[PDB]
Design a protein around this motif. Structure first.
Motif, mmCIF file in Angstrom:
data_model
loop_
_atom_site.group_PDB
_atom_site.id
_atom_site.type_symbol
_atom_site.label_atom_id
_atom_site.label_comp_id
_atom_site.label_asym_id
_atom_site.label_seq_id
_atom_site.Cartn_x
_atom_site.Cartn_y
_atom_site.Cartn_z
ATOM 1 N N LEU A 147 45.416 31.317 28.272
ATOM 2 C CA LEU A 147 45.030 32.371 29.033
ATOM 3 C C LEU A 147 46.191 33.485 29.105
ATOM 4 C CD1 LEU A 147 43.466 34.427 30.737
ATOM 5 C CD2 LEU A 147 44.228 32.887 33.013
ATOM 6 N N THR A 182 34.659 45.981 37.950
ATOM 7 C CA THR A 182 35.699 46.671 38.810
ATOM 8 C C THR A 182 35.608 48.202 38.761
ATOM 9 O OG1 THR A 182 37.187 46.350 37.130
ATOM 10 C CG2 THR A 182 37.118 44.688 38.656
ATOM 11 N N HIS A 202 38.591 47.412 47.659
ATOM 12 C CA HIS A 202 39.265 46.003 46.592
ATOM 13 C C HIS A 202 37.970 45.640 46.159
ATOM 14 C CE1 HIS A 202 41.114 43.171 44.643
ATOM 15 N NE2 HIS A 202 41.989 42.974 45.065
ATOM 16 N N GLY A 226 44.637 45.192 33.466
ATOM 17 C CA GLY A 226 43.726 46.291 33.243
ATOM 18 C C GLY A 226 43.929 47.549 34.073
HETATM 19 C C1 HEM Z 1 39.615 48.874 39.407
HETATM 20 C C2 HEM Z 1 39.785 48.030 38.424
HETATM 21 C C3 HEM Z 1 40.539 46.672 38.708
HETATM 22 C C4 HEM Z 1 40.770 46.064 39.708
HETATM 23 C C5 HEM Z 1 41.098 46.279 41.189
HETATM 24 C C6 HEM Z 1 41.287 44.774 39.008
HETATM 25 C C7 HEM Z 1 41.629 43.485 39.979
HETATM 26 C C8 HEM Z 1 42.153 42.462 39.341
HETATM 27 C C9 HEM Z 1 42.438 41.247 40.224
HETATM 28 C C10 HEM Z 1 42.566 41.292 41.499
HETATM 29 C C11 HEM Z 1 42.872 40.125 39.353
HETATM 30 C C12 HEM Z 1 43.279 38.845 39.643
HETATM 31 C C13 HEM Z 1 42.577 37.845 40.486
HETATM 32 C C14 HEM Z 1 43.167 36.702 41.059
HETATM 33 O O1 HEM Z 1 44.318 36.778 41.280
HETATM 34 O O2 HEM Z 1 42.428 35.630 41.198
HETATM 35 C C15 HEM Z 1 42.432 40.763 37.944
HETATM 36 C C16 HEM Z 1 42.917 39.804 36.841
HETATM 37 C C17 HEM Z 1 42.547 40.316 35.509
HETATM 38 N N1 HEM Z 1 41.728 41.508 35.002
HETATM 39 FE FE1 HEM Z 1 41.619 43.118 36.245
HETATM 40 N N2 HEM Z 1 41.004 44.623 37.550
HETATM 41 C C18 HEM Z 1 40.636 45.833 37.411
HETATM 42 C C19 HEM Z 1 40.291 46.276 36.071
HETATM 43 C C20 HEM Z 1 40.366 45.471 34.987
HETATM 44 C C21 HEM Z 1 40.099 46.173 33.822
HETATM 45 C C22 HEM Z 1 39.534 47.614 33.305
HETATM 46 C C23 HEM Z 1 40.305 44.897 32.809
HETATM 47 C C24 HEM Z 1 40.383 45.058 31.124
HETATM 48 C C25 HEM Z 1 40.327 46.191 30.575
HETATM 49 C C26 HEM Z 1 40.961 43.977 33.572
HETATM 50 C C27 HEM Z 1 41.165 42.586 33.134
HETATM 51 C C28 HEM Z 1 41.711 41.838 33.740
HETATM 52 C C29 HEM Z 1 42.172 40.259 33.284
HETATM 53 C C30 HEM Z 1 42.197 40.420 31.679
HETATM 54 C C31 HEM Z 1 42.917 39.477 34.307
HETATM 55 C C32 HEM Z 1 43.533 38.300 34.164
HETATM 56 C C33 HEM Z 1 42.901 37.049 34.774
HETATM 57 C C34 HEM Z 1 43.789 35.794 34.920
HETATM 58 O O3 HEM Z 1 44.680 36.086 34.727
HETATM 59 O O4 HEM Z 1 43.222 34.873 35.748
HETATM 60 N N3 HEM Z 1 40.871 44.385 34.955
HETATM 61 N N4 HEM Z 1 42.021 41.977 38.122
#
Ligand code: HEM
Ligand SMILES: CC[C@@H](C)n1ncn(-c2ccc(N3CCN(c4ccc(OC[C@H]5CO[C@](Cn6cncn6)(c6ccc(Cl)cc6Cl)O5)cc4)CC3)cc2)c1=O
Length: 527
Positions: free
Chosen positions: A140, A311, A371, A465
């Motif tokens: 990951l 999201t 959120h 992201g």
């Molecule tokens: C409003 C937009 C977004 C919000 C609020 C958001 C929020 C989050 C949050 C809260 C997490 C962590 C969840 C946890 O801690 O259990 C996360 C992980 C992630 N998000 Fe986003 N995200 C957004 C947009 C995006 C976009 C546009 C992408 C890709 C282009 C993306 C890809 C990812 C990836 C690859 C992870 C990592 C998962 C992991 O490490 O377990 N996100 N996101």
């Protein structure tokens, strides 16, 4: 003791001499009573957070938690403080509210907690095998590294005019707008925003080929796969129904399309720097030499697009909805657009997006109030002692953290249920490491995760992201603002969130009425 043990055996046997009207009815009643007995006993424990009392075994507090989690958290916080547990569909969830909870969970040691054990059933059936949560944590970490490589300033610089073009094309061609033929119209933002999000994210992250494919009946697979991305998967990942077969089929058909493009490009050595596909073709070798397969690369792409889909679409819907009753903010945003882009005579670039703080504050404020993910989970792997308490969280439990809850506390954000982008004056960055940093495999990020504002989480599972999201949302809103004014149908206001979907999307049908700022303006190109 003599005759006692005999009457135990006798009693066990007389049990079976009961009519099943009694036997089934006690098969229900016995677990119910033990449940209450076990809870009453549990409450004695000093090394356990308060457990929320519940009547129905296994089901637990699922219904009230599911329908209104922040209200649920508020009531529990009042009675028990910031740490408490509750049963949820067979699992025990230990909530830890506020900044200290963020630290307890996001900065928990890799050994103590597991995100893939919490999340895999949600995602693996939709995205495919070998990636994201269907692999070890270090895999990951590197997949996040690989993806981040297509998310650079230079990539955003080239994405912006692509994303812009898609927004205009959508205004031109979508039945929801058709600005060359209509000057006003009504739209459901939960129809328009998922469409605009998939068009803009396709074009930019996937490339022209995969965007082109959305103008065919291939688009029906995205819908099919999208419907498979549902919290039900947390309980029923696979059931022998049409829904699950449609999903499974879609995952195969869509990943197959990506693999076709990938193998086509490699065959011709047409591997450039156009999109995330090119990027992952040049750069998907783990630190132990193992290379991602074409299948894993495609599954990774599905997840990224899908995660970013929900999201972002939910977020631009909420932005639209909050601006619909605030013509003052629309006006304020419009003036920032005229100033930065010289009355429209400058083309929007990535650099100019950075000189639009009010726009970015608007995104930031929307993410505070909405959120998209109200609850983040980890399964506890080793027993955890909660610092400065007697609490020990045992393995087999889940920890639940919720920055979305803290986003809505007046203690941290005065008047937290009021939408006010000016609370972020002097502070329009999507986020930023307030101090020291750390690298889990995808780049230096903030070591401390105690910010009350935390839409992208932190620690090893931190989102990568956020700058793509701000780029996408930014180009999109910049164009919405310069092109349209919008408002509510008479008597309507901002809907309440649906806390039972994958993301905290608005409750339908959420409609706004748009009108052209320049009724006579035409969008060029062919249709
Ligand atoms: C409003 C937009 C977004 C919000 C609020 C958001 C929020 C989050 C949050 C809260 C997490 C962590 C969840 C946890 O801690 O259990 C996360 C992980 C992630 N998000 Fe986003 N995200 C957004 C947009 C995006 C976009 C546009 C992408 C890709 C282009 C993306 C890809 C990812 C990836 C690859 C992870 C990592 C998962 C992991 O490490 O377990 N996100 N996101
Ligand atoms: C049955 C009775 C009824 C009343 N009920 N009872 C309980 N509930 C319920 C409870 C909880 C929830 N959910 C809502 C969804 N939620 C949740 C959803 C997604 C999620 O994602 C975290 C990880 C995995 O997915 C992504 C999401 N993402 C982040 N940025 C962009 N997307 C992710 C990360 C990386 C990649 Cl590549 C893809 C994806 Cl999807 O991050 C975490 C929690 C859990 C609680 C829903 C209903 C009910 O509806």
């Amino acid at each position: 003791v003599g005759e006692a043990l005999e009457y135990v055996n006798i009693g066990l046997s007389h049990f079976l001499a009961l009519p099943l009207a009694q036997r089934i009815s006690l098969i229900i009643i016995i677990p119910f009573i033990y449940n209450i007995v076990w809870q009453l006993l549990y409450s004695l424990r000093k090394d356990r957070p308060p457990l929320v009392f519940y009547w129905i075994p296994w089901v637990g507090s699922a219904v009230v938690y599911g329908m209104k989690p922040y209200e649920f958290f508020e009531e529990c916080q009042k009675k028990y403080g910031d740490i408490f547990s509750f049963v949820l569909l067979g699992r025990v969830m230990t909530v830890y509210l506020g900044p200290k909870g963020h630290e307890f969970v996001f900065n928990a040691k890799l050994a103590d907690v597991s995100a893939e054990a919490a999340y895999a059933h949600l995602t693996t059936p939709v995205f495919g095998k070998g990636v994201i949560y269907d692999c070890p944590n270090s895999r990951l970490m590197e997949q996040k590294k690989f993806v981040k490589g297509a998310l650079t300033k230079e990539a955003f610089k080239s994405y912006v005019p692509l994303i812009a073009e898609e927004v205009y094309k959508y205004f031109r061609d979508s039945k929801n707008f058709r600005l060359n033929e209509r000057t006003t119209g009504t739209i459901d933002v939960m129809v328009t925003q998922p469409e605009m999000t998939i068009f803009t994210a396709s074009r930019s992250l996937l490339g022209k080929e995969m965007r082109a494919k959305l103008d065919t009946d291939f688009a029906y697979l995205y819908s099919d796969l999208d419907k498979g991305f549902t919290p039900i998967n947390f309980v029923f990942p696979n059931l022998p129904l049409e829904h699950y077969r449609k999903r499974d089929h879609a995952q195969k058909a869509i990943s197959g399309t990506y693999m076709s493009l990938i193998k086509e490009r490699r065959k011709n050595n047409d591997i450039q720097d156009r999109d995330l596909i090119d990027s992952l073709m040049k750069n998907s070798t783990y630190k132990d030499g193992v290379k991602m397969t074409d299948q894993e690369i495609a599954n990774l792409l599905i997840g990224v697009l899908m995660g970013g889909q929900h999201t972002s679409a939910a977020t631009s819907a909420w932005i639209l909805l909050h601006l619909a009753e605030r013509p003052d903010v629309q006006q304020e945003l419009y003036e920032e657009q005229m100033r930065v882009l010289d009355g429209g005579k400058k083309e929007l670039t990535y650099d100019l997006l950075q000189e639009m703080p009010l726009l970015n504050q608007t995104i930031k404020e929307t993410l505070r109030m909405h959120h998209p993910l109200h609850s983040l989970f980890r399964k506890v792997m080793k027993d955890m002692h909660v610092p400065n308490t007697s609490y020990v969280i045992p393995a087999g439990y889940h920890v639940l953290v919720s920055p979305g809850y803290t986003h809505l506390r007046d203690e941290y954000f005065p008047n937290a249920h009021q939408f006010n982008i000016h609370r972020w004056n002097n502070d329009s960055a999507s986020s930023y490491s307030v101090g020291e940093e750390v690298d889990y495999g995808f780049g230096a990020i903030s070591k401390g995760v105690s910010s009350p504002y935390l839409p992208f989480s932190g620690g090893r599972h931190r989102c990568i992201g956020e700058h793509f999201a701000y780029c996408q949302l930014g180009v999109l809103m910049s164009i919405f603002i310069r092109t349209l004014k919008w408002h509510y149908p008479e008597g309507k206001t901002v809907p309440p969130p649906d806390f039972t979907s994958m993301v905290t999307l608005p409750t339908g049908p959420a409609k706004i009425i748009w009108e052209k700022r320049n009724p006579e303006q035409k969008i060029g190109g062919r249709h």
